[PDB]
Amino acid sequence: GEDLYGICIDIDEFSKTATIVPITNNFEGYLVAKDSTVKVKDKLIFNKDGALEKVKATINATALTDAKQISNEVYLVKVAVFGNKA
Amino acid sequence: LFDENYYAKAVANIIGEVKDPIMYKWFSPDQIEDVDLQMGYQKTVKWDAFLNANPTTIANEVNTISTIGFSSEVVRLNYLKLQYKFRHLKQTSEKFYTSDSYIGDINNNLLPFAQAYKLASSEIIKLINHFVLTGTVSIQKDGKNQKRLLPNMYGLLNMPEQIKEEVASGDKDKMDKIFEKIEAGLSKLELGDEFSTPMMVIVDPATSLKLVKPYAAASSCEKWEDVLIQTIKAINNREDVYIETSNLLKHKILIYPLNSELIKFKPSKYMLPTPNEQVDKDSTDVAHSYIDFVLGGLLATRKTILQVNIKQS
Amino acid sequence: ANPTTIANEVNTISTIGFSSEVVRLNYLKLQYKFRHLKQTSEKFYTSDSYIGD
Amino acid sequence: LFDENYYAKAVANIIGEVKDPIMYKWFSPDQIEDVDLQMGYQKTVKWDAFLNANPTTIANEVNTISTIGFSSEVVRLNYLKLQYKFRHLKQTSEKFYTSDSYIGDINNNLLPFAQAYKLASSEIIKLINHFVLTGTVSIQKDGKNQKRLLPNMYGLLNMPEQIKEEVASGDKDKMDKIFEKIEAGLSKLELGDEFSTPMMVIVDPATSLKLVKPYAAASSCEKWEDVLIQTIKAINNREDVYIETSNLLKHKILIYPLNSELIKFKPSKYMLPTPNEQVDKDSTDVAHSYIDFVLGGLLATRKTILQVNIKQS
Amino acid sequence: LFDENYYAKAVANIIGEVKDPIMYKWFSPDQIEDVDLQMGYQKTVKWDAFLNANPTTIANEVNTISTIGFSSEVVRLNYLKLQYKFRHLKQTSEKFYTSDSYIGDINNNLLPFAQAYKLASSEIIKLINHFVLTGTVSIQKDGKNQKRLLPNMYGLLNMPEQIKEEVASGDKDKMDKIFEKIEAGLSKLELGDEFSTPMMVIVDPATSLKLVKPYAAASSCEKWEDVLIQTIKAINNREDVYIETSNLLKHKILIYPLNSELIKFKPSKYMLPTPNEQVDKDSTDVAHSYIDFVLGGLLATRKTILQVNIKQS
Amino acid sequence: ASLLDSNFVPINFTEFVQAISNTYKQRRIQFYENLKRHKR
């Protein structure tokens, strides 16, 4: 939503510490998607659960590939996020 | 390295100016043992034995004898690494700030690397002592905004399964009520076969000032401190009872034995502040350095620490 | 701020700040004036047990 | 240099464990010559002649005579320098991760510099071999999202102006139709005066499985592989014919001679992975290293490569 | 040091090929003194006396007498430190760029470190000379968007409290009117007891070409320059009057003595370009270096410099 | 303590910078020694 502060790119469960890229820095990588209805050249928005869903987008995120399924709910998609819209 | 690393040379030359932590006065010499770890966990095993039945008399011929069983207990201790960063002046740029009265920059609050390292190390040692005493890490005077730490990382005041007594706010100034609570906690203390052990008490300055009052129809030639010493000597088999005052505590009284078999501090050999090799540099005269320190490593037996909190609200 | 946990990769670390303090002590000079008798005139004011008008 | 830099010593001590590329089997020893370049182009000139018209009969007096034309062709080979970055553990921080059996954090997928470099070099060599074979650079099984490469950068499979045969989808399993297409391509091959040279064929595992079936009623002691070898021996003056199976290829058959006068590989002397001097260090235990590799340099004469694609759709 | 850092060796080998600044011709050897400061200020104190009223006649008895007053003046000179960054090629990358008769990427405008440093130092010396003359720092030819500098930082042309004359637009080409204005300024000069000293005039090329014309019928064997030299010799006790031309000036004539008592230049010992130890490095072949230079340090007595501006149109 | 002297072997960047400054001062001194102004 509008409360997005950054994106968690790494985790350490022993120390319970998340390494995070702030929204002010552009990122290119695989992130969790809500479902498998995301194609290339699609505007994506972070939902209330922190997952990328296909499109009022405060940020500018575009999927580079299609959603790829690994587990029953694990859907990774390559996305480049390069700031906020206006 | 010294011919190459001026920062390392300065750290070596100024390492003696820092003072020993005050936590060293709270433990027996044999109650502290260094370990080799920076972050992670370490497990310790304790082996105990027991008898299964009454003894067997060796008369004539016999084949069936009573048995002795064994048991084990495993305890995990977690160790965490933390870092601080501080700015300072470049060695080549110091000569342009070496004034006659002092060396540094007053207007921009810039210091030589040696002095900055000394002050940062002193502050970090104070923080480490606070952590060892209270089991929390915070910078606010209210003790809020605490840094969330890992499990199995406890201090003296927050060690689980100890004896805790609370003196009510109505009796916040009544030494008789305070000593009633202390006696209740001392009775609830359990030392087993290690009761014959010197004991240590840590009190806040207000509690110390209340203790130095004469024992009370007021009396003479006796203090509440002496009364407390006698009460503790009742349970420790008339052993030594040392008393210390710490400004970190606030309306708290801590009582614990100085026994390695009951309470042991196994801290990391890198717990005290250590300079980092990464030194940020730039085209300007301001550089940055890092200091590392390791926290964790306290082990205590259950129901061996008494904590009396005098509620003030 | 609170110390930074060194886990995995991190670039933002808590800082330790420094401060300078200049302490100044001021001094003041004060004077008083008092009247008395000239040395040559004391013989005309000496008395049985005291000197002075 | 080794006494000062640890990473260079580790690279030198672990460079031997990296296996040789499999692309070396695809070429004869004389067909490969190294060039000294990292990014740029190498150009050569070839001179050809042609007849302009029918000859002129020298009878009585004549001044106008038929002419012979000449032409030049400039052939350019482009090279590209590419880089990869990988994360590893710091040399000083290794001792805090050196477990009994494994060295490195399993949870965080962190490895020592030597092992990380070995694995990264192996992956980069796999990528280089794939590029040399197919003429494309990609990391997807479907073959999409290919890297846009400079012109005059071609592989054995995507080389233009070569003989290309296509087996239809209906005849995907008909080895007779596949061999008919191969025979047509072999007839269309033009070797010129360099025919007396060994030949090399590269096939997919499915094609290799189909080859060993008896030649077709089924023959006795005569298989499709033997028939193909005889057919190639017919055109190469009965020279040696080598057959290789490559997992990189899929439903593709590649036939080409092993003569340096027709096909030559002039790769950069820095084509294989080489570590970079720059090392990204920080205050933590994680460091970053870079590997460089150069791509490009395959030169082939026109109409000397047969490429058979079996449409599986 | 040279073995560890190649850039220092390159700077040491290339520094001898940098030409001396042209500002040296504008001062005497005694007028220039080096100070040991990079950034900051330097202060001096001067004491003056003055008469308050007409003298009092000592006739009969009088108690009220005229007074002689005194005053102190504190003079401050500021010194500023400035820096530039320039890109160049990494030392261990030149072999891949050495052409037949040059080194560097022409298409991308990349140079070796030595050549880049030499060109940068030449440009910085040009800017330093421009600052020493005009008292401003700007890269535009219109003298706009100037860098805001600290007070007490002046040049020979923007120095306040000096004699200023303005030749009108109608008399732009009238050397007689220009000389009349110069004579007025010379009369308004206040050299005083320091009159016996050499004098220096700095003139623009157009006005110099106007000067070299014969003095005006026209007097043979007598030029306007000769008349000006005689006029200045009238006031400087028949001392040497040097005349120089500078393209930096435009329709400006600057006359000032060469006495260290009146005009002094106390520049920093690090005013001229000096390389910085910080060298940005990456995995590519492009590196960045830094050059430092210090500005400031011109002191002059008031009403000792004549500045003539010929208003053009 | 100047870059002109071949025997001078700097030990660190501070000494190198001091040598650069001394060399600049010596160059200025030499220029003023060899200067010959035009007196006419």
DSSP, residue by residue, chain B: -TTT-HHHHHHHHHTTTSPPPGGGGGS-GGGB--B--SSEEEEEEEEEEEE-S------S-------EEEEEEEEEEEEEEEEEEEEEE-HHHHTTTB-SS-BSBTTTTB--HHHHHHHHHHHHHHHHHHHHHHS----STTS-SPPP--TT---TTT-SS-EEEEE-GGGTT-HHHHHHHHHHHHHH---GGG-SS-EEEEE-HHHHHHHTSBP----SS-BHHHHHHHHHHHHTTS--EEEEE-TT-SSEEEEEE--TTTEEE--BTT-S-EE-S--B--SSSEEEEEEEEEE--EEE-TT--EEEEE---
CA distance D300 to D158: 11
Picking from D84, D104, D120, the residue whose alpha carbon sits closest to that of residue D11 is D120
CA distance D70 to E29: 75
- The pair phi, psi for residue B190, each rounded to 5°, is -130, 110
Interface test with B, best of F14, F16, F21 (most B CBs within 10 A): F14
Tell if the CB–CB gap between D277 and E92 is shorter than 8 Å: yes
Q: Which two tokens stand for residue E259?
A: 């006495």
Picking from D181, D199, D183, the residue whose alpha carbon sits closest to that of residue D191 is D199
| CB of E72 closer than 8 Å to CB of E46 | yes
The minimal CB distance from B85 to the residues C7, C16, C22 is found for C16
Q: D103: which strand partners?
A: D98
Q: Which two tokens stand for residue B280?
A: 């940020």
| B148 CB within 8 Å of a chain A CB | yes
Q: Which two tokens stand for residue D224?
A: 């499709």
User: How buried is residue B65: exposed, middle or buried, by Cβ count under 10 Å (0-12/13-18/19+)?
Assistant: exposed
Residues of B in contact with C7 (CB under 8 A): 39
CA distance D133 to D121: 18
Picking from D8, D153, D159, the residue whose alpha carbon sits closest to that of residue D82 is D153
How big, in percent rounded to 5, are the helix, strand and coil portions of chain C? 10, 10, 75
* Integer-rounded Cα radius of gyration of chain D: 26
- Chain E residue with CA closest to F16: the answer is E8
- Chain D residue with CA closest to B278: the answer is D283
Q: Which two tokens stand for residue A63?
A: 């999927």
CA distance D239 to D196: 7
Q: D269: which strand partners?
A: none
Resolution in A: 2.7
CA distance E34 to F28: 11
CA distance A37 to A53: 8
User: Distance from first CA to last CA of chain F, Å, rounded?
Assistant: 40
- The pair phi, psi for residue E160, each rounded to 5°, is -80, 170
* Structural element, H or E, at residue D164: strand D163-167
Task: Map residue D206 onto helix, strand or coil.
Answer: helix
Picking from B265, B244, B242, B261, the residue whose alpha carbon sits closest to that of residue B191 is B261
Tell if the CB–CB gap between A15 and B148 is shorter than 8 Å: no
Picking from E206, E186, E201, E191, the residue whose alpha carbon sits closest to that of residue E242 is E201
The minimal CB distance from E15 to the residues F10, F23, F39 is found for F23
CA distance D111 to D104: 5
What residue type is assigned to position D260 of the chain? S
How far does C25 lie from chain B, in Å, by closest CA?
16
Instruction: Give break positions in chain C: residue before each, C–N beyond 2.5 Å.
Output: none
| CB of D308 closer than 8 Å to CB of D182 | yes
The minimal CB distance from E15 to the residues F3, F9, F39 is found for F3
Left (φ > 0), alpha (ψ -120 to 50) or beta: where does B104 sit? left
CA distance E63 to E59: 11
| CB of B49 closer than 8 Å to CB of B70 | yes
| A15 CB within 8 Å of a chain D CB | no
Q: Which two tokens stand for residue E205?
A: 């090329």
User: How buried is residue B39: exposed, middle or buried, by Cβ count under 10 Å (0-12/13-18/19+)?
Assistant: buried
User: Concatenated DSSP letters for E171-220?
Assistant: TSS-HHHHHHHHHHHHHH---GGGGSS-EEEEE-HHHHHHHTSBP----T
How far does A49 lie from chain B, in Å, by closest CA?
24
Tell if the CB–CB gap between E96 and D277 is shorter than 8 Å: no
Residue appearing with tokens 């040692």 = B125
Tell if the CB–CB gap between C8 and D284 is shorter than 8 Å: yes
Residue E142 vs residues E15, E79, E137, E138, E139: alpha-carbon distances, Å: 32, 26, 12, 9, 9
User: Distance from first CA to last CA of chain C, Å, rounded?
Assistant: 77
CA distance E113 to E119: 10
Residue appearing with tokens 């320190």 = B293
How far does F27 lie from chain E, in Å, by closest CA?
8
The minimal CB distance from E290 to the residues B92, B96, B283 is found for B283
User: How buried is residue A46: exposed, middle or buried, by Cβ count under 10 Å (0-12/13-18/19+)?
Assistant: buried
- The pair phi, psi for residue B210, each rounded to 5°, is -65, -35
C and B touching (3 or more beta-carbon pairs closer than 8 Å): yes
Q: D253: which strand partners?
A: D203, D308
- The pair phi, psi for residue D113, each rounded to 5°, is -60, -40
CA distance E185 to B112: 54
What chains are in contact with A, requiring at least 3 Cβ pairs below 8 Å?
B, C, D
Q: Do the strands A17-22 and A68-69 form a parallel or antiparallel pair, or are they unpaired? A: unpaired
- The pair phi, psi for residue A31, each rounded to 5°, is -130, 160
Residues of E in contact with D290 (CB under 8 A): 283
Residues of E in contact with F38 (CB under 8 A): 242-243
CA distance B229 to B203: 13
CA distance C49 to C51: 7
Q: Which two tokens stand for residue B167?
A: 């003196």
Picking from E45, E73, E82, E42, the residue whose alpha carbon sits closest to that of residue E265 is E42
CA distance B285 to E83: 12
Residue E289 vs residues B285, D104, E279: alpha-carbon distances, Å: 16, 38, 5
Residue B45 vs residues B38, B77, B150, B190, B305: alpha-carbon distances, Å: 21, 12, 21, 21, 22
CA distance D108 to D86: 14
Picking from E270, E275, E276, E274, the residue whose alpha carbon sits closest to that of residue E296 is E270
Tell if the CB–CB gap between C5 and B82 is shorter than 8 Å: yes
Tell if the CB–CB gap between D284 and C9 is shorter than 8 Å: yes
- Chain D residue with CA closest to A64: the answer is D145
Q: Which of residues 95-124 of D touch C (CB under 8 A)?
A: 108
| CB of A18 closer than 8 Å to CB of A8 | yes
Tell if the CB–CB gap between E1 and F15 is shorter than 8 Å: yes
* Integer-rounded Cα radius of gyration of chain C: 37
User: How buried is residue C24: exposed, middle or buried, by Cβ count under 10 Å (0-12/13-18/19+)?
Assistant: exposed
- The pair phi, psi for residue D239, each rounded to 5°, is -90, 175
CA distance A60 to A82: 6
Tell if the CB–CB gap between D108 and A65 is shorter than 8 Å: no
CA distance E76 to B217: 78
CA distance D160 to D150: 15
| CB of E120 closer than 8 Å to CB of E292 | no
How far does B97 lie from chain E, in Å, by closest CA?
10
| CB of B236 closer than 8 Å to CB of B257 | yes
Picking from D303, D301, D26, D310, the residue whose alpha carbon sits closest to that of residue D185 is D303
Q: Which two tokens stand for residue E164?
A: 């200023």
The minimal CB distance from E282 to the residues D38, D39, D278 is found for D278
What residue type is assigned to position B275 of the chain? P
CA distance D190 to D180: 18
| B150 CB within 8 Å of a chain A CB | yes
| C12 CB within 8 Å of a chain D CB | no
Picking from B285, A4, B294, D282, the residue whose alpha carbon sits closest to that of residue C12 is D282
| CB of E312 closer than 8 Å to CB of E206 | no
| D278 CB within 8 Å of a chain A CB | no
Residues of E in contact with F20 (CB under 8 A): 11, 15, 274
CA distance D179 to D308: 10
Q: D287: which strand partners?
A: D88
Task: Spell out the residues 6+ positions from residue A66 whose beta carbon is closer than 8 angstroms to its own.
Answer: A36, A38, A39, A40, A77
Residue D203 vs residues D27, D158, D253, D305: alpha-carbon distances, Å: 15, 15, 5, 14
| B80 CB within 8 Å of a chain A CB | yes
How far does C7 lie from chain A, in Å, by closest CA?
7
Interface test with A, best of D97, D107, D139 (most A CBs within 10 A): D107
The CA dihedral of D264, D268, D274, D279, to the nearest 10 degrees, is -150
Q: Which two tokens stand for residue D124?
A: 């980069």
Number of H helices, E strands in chain A: 0, 8
How far does B83 lie from chain E, in Å, by closest CA?
26
Tell if the CB–CB gap between B37 and D281 is shorter than 8 Å: no
The minimal CB distance from F13 to the residues E8, E34, E240 is found for E8
> What string of H, E and C letters represents the secondary structure of B160-220?
CCCEEEEECHHHCCCHHHHHHHHHHHHHHCCCHHHCCCCEEEEECHHHHHHHCCECCCCCC
- The pair phi, psi for residue E117, each rounded to 5°, is -65, -40
What chains are in contact with F, requiring at least 3 Cβ pairs below 8 Å?
B, E
CA distance B211 to B234: 19
| CB of D90 closer than 8 Å to CB of D287 | yes
* Structural element, H or E, at residue D225: helix D224-235
- Chain B residue with CA closest to E280: the answer is B282
Residue appearing with tokens 């995907």 = D172
| CB of B88 closer than 8 Å to CB of B288 | yes
Task: Spell out the residues 6+ positions from residue E294 whose beta carbon is closer than 8 angstroms to its own.
Answer: E37, E38, E39, E79, E80, E81, E82, E267, E268, E270, E271
Residues of D in contact with C9 (CB under 8 A): 87, 282, 284, 286
How far does D139 lie from chain B, in Å, by closest CA?
36
User: How buried is residue E309: exposed, middle or buried, by Cβ count under 10 Å (0-12/13-18/19+)?
Assistant: middle
CA distance B135 to B127: 11
Task: Map residue D207 onto helix, strand or coil.
Answer: helix
| CB of B279 closer than 8 Å to CB of B287 | yes
Residue B72: how many CA atoms within 13 Å on its side-chain side? 5
| C8 CB within 8 Å of a chain A CB | yes
Residue D82 vs residues B96, B181, E152: alpha-carbon distances, Å: 45, 75, 55
Picking from E257, E272, E79, the residue whose alpha carbon sits closest to that of residue F28 is E272
| B77 CB within 8 Å of a chain A CB | no
CA distance B79 to B297: 7
CA distance E289 to E169: 48
| D38 CB within 8 Å of a chain E CB | yes
How far does B19 lie from chain D, in Å, by closest CA?
26
Task: Spell out the residues 6+ positions from residue B147 whose beta carbon is closer than 8 angstroms to its own.
Answer: B137, B138, C2, C3
Residues of C in contact with D87 (CB under 8 A): 9
Tell if the CB–CB gap between C9 and A15 is shorter than 8 Å: no
- The pair phi, psi for residue C13, each rounded to 5°, is -120, 150
Picking from E90, E77, E6, E140, the residue whose alpha carbon sits closest to that of residue E295 is E77
Q: Which two tokens stand for residue D238?
A: 């009965």
User: Concatenated DSSP letters for chain E?
Assistant: -TTT-HHHHHHHHHGGGSPPPGGGGGS-GGGB--B--SSEEEEEEEEEEEE-SPPPP--SS------EEEEEEEEEEEEEEEEEEEEEE-GGGGGGTB-SS-BSBTTTTB--HHHHHHHHHHHHHHHHHHHHHHS---SSTT--SPPP--SS---SSS-SSSEEEEE-STTSS-HHHHHHHHHHHHHH---GGGGSS-EEEEE-HHHHHHHTSBP----TT-BHHHHHHHHHHHHTTS--EEEEE-TT-SSEEEEEE--TTTEEE--BTT-S-EEEEEEE--SSSEEEEEEEEEE--EEE-SS--EEEEE---
* Structural element, H or E, at residue D209: helix D205-211
Check residue D181 and report its DSSP letter. H
| CB of B80 closer than 8 Å to CB of B295 | yes
Instruction: Give break positions in chain A: residue before each, C–N beyond 2.5 Å.
Output: 55
Interface test with B, best of E85, E277, E281, E293 (most B CBs within 10 A): E277
D and F touching (3 or more beta-carbon pairs closer than 8 Å): no
Check residue F13 and report its DSSP letter. H
